[PDB]
Amino acid sequence: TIDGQPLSLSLYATPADPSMLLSAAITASQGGGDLPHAVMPMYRFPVI
């Protein structure tokens, strides 16, 4: 203008959106235990 001020206004672009925070419950695997060696007792079945 006569003072040096613009006629066509400036751009005001859209800022970045707030994101959604993400996590994860990652999982592992330990196997089952190997069954041991059986030992014959000296007592009968009700006692042992």
Added chain:
Amino acid sequence: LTQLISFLFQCTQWLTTQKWSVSDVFLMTTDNYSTVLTPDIENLITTLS
């Protein structure tokens, strides 16, 4: 074509009503899963075995 437009509209409104993304229904629906064997699958194997 107008049937496919109507389908896309009712599916999109269904998605935004349920607050699900397209990735959600894709995870719930697809056949393009990966075939790698996951510790979740392994836990299912040994638990149910």
